[PDB]
Design a protein around this ligand. Structure first.
Ligand code: MG
Lengths: 349, 349
């Protein structure tokens, strides 16, 4: 499959960088090995696949192996995003396994090392995320020099600068929204647009289009396609974060309410409750982002259901997915890319 | 001066990126403004100046303004290193001014925001350092495509990949050495070579040489030059970190011992004490990295001086600086670069 060919390019790149850095000792080599296990650990490779279909949409032939490596840089970049995300969220586990700060703090305590184990774990986690960022970037620099004409080089860099600027802005806007208790739907839609629409769908699509051809028409359509599908992805995640199966999602029931996320679903519930039951709106406003018992959480989830927020989210997802498919159907791109992107928009739900 | 022209290129670059990111709101704009304030806050511009003399050594003409912007990328990269360093060290101030995590925790309290102000400060500081890194790299990508021939592009990327790989390895090796109580002079020499020799002198020099010409002979000589002068810089800092006047250094008296650093000075003191005062060696071994009173610190400083570690460090600094100037005198480079590098090696030492 295409995800495996993209992943194999990344495995060979990481293996080469690791070997070339072996003179720095076995401790740094162990950190690189940790990065290999996290990045290559397995997944759908959603963002590199969006880059492929963006290339397929405006290209005739298949990309060179080095261009597949360019698409894989989005996977290495995502490791940077997730590792620093786990520090910002103070998450203990990811996919059932301990986060980086916990793995290195436990290593500190197993070795009977001195100083604070938790300080070492956070410091090592910062550096682990930093390494993924500089190496994901080094891929783009290396592939641009070796496999791309200078015009494709300039188009690729401008997408690469935007996607890293937008995911950093999205991260900061999110912690500001949670700290300031931003209630509005517009605030949550802004974060979802930067974090999910731009970072996961639109900009990956434009990376493959930029590497293939000078098609500003298609890049603008993919931005409109990603703005609808990306928000649909976020709302699905928000619904699952409140009402989903914990054994499936990996997070407890009502986790978003537990953690105090400022989702569109939450913002929509406060707005609907303002019109239907002001006392339910006051319950939501004073409970979100606080330490909630299991009973308080079940009550908040039911109130979100009672005022129609979940039903409103489901129709949002249906409408956005339908328009995104309509934008895809009438796009001046190869029909084979229209099939794979409708496939991917469904395989990724 | 040359530092001002380099700084002006960075200020104009940062102003452009800030304006182009204005659509992301006033909160993210305040983070970028804080980045401008920190990077442009003032300094020697030591690392961009090393890059200039590396260019001057093998070039005929002066660099174009865009190449000065390439040299300024080292200053933006240094903000990434310092911001994340302040998090790794849990430092509260830097040169008398609060660190990033403290500035953003104060913003959180000023706004009466929700959650932990210190957790917000650490998260914002992580993102701030991440932003400096991606924008420092966006400079290198932008200048390479627009102002450099493809061969110079490839030489510049190789140095850019090495300097960020080596400062990350030096950071991890340092926290591992402190946590594992690495006593050897070799371990401290390895960290000082990566953190100071490579990162501050050698690689910046090679960045300017790479941007100017294909001179493998000069790049290898600057590596030998930086390996001596860079360690001499660190040994001077280590002596000042233990014996320096707080009015001159700006740091407390005996700060390195208070902070528990694994310096060559401390490593050499343990080795010298093993020969002359074995019980003083045990006092050093069991006190470095612990909570020390002001009397314990004064006691350790006197022991370090008594066993001759301070005098050994002074002769190391003298020998390394003398050999570095001898390597500079016999280098196949322009004599004007030989003068500026001897002057630059003096203004810093
Ligand atoms: Mg680049």
């Amino acid at each position: 499959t295409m995800a495996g060919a993209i992943t194999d390019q990344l495995r060979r790149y990481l293996h080469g960088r690791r070997r070339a850095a072996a003179h720095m000792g076995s401790d740094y080599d162990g950190l690189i090995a940790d990065l290999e296990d996290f990045v290559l650990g397995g997944g759908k490779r959603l963002r590199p696949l969006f880059a492929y279909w963006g290339w397929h949409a405006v290209a005739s032939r298949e990309p060179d192996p080095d261009v597949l490596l360019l698409f894989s840089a989005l996977e290495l970049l995502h490791a940077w995003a997730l590792v620093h995300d786990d520090l910002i969220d103070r998450s203990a586990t990811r996919r059932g396994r301990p986060t980086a700060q916990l793995r290195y703090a436990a290593l500190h305590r197993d070795r009977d090392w001195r100083g604070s184990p938790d300080q070492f774990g956070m410091s090592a986690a910062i550096l682990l995320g930093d390494l993924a960022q500089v190496w994901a970037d080094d891929i783009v620099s290396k592939v641009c020099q070796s496999a791309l004409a200078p015009d494709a080089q300039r188009r690729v860099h401008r997408v690469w600068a935007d996607i890293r600027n937008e995911v950093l802005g999205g991260q900061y806007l999110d912690i500001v929204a949670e700290a300031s208790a931003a209630e509005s739907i517009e605030s949550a839609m802004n974060v979802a647009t930067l974090k999910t629409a731009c970072y996961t769908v639109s900009r990956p699509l434009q990376l493959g289009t930029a590497a293939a051809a000078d098609r500003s028409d298609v890049a603008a359509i993919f931005e409109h396609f990603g703005a609808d599908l990306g928000v649909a992805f976020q709302l699905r995640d928000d619904v699952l974060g409140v009402f989903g199966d914990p054994a499936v999602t990996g997070k407890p029931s009502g986790d978003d309410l537990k953690s105090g996320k400022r989702t569109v679903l939450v913002a929509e519930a406060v707005e609907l409750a303002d019109r239907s039951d002001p006392l339910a709106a006051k319950l939501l406003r004073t409970s979100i982002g606080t330490r909630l018992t299991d009973a308080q959480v079940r009550e908040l989830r039911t109130v979100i259901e009672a005022v129609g927020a979940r039903a409103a989210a489901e129709s949002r997802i249906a409408a956005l997915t339908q328009r995104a498919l309509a934008t895809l159907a009438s796009a001046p791109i190869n029909a084979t890319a229209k099939a794979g992107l409708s496939e991917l928009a469904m395989m990724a739900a």
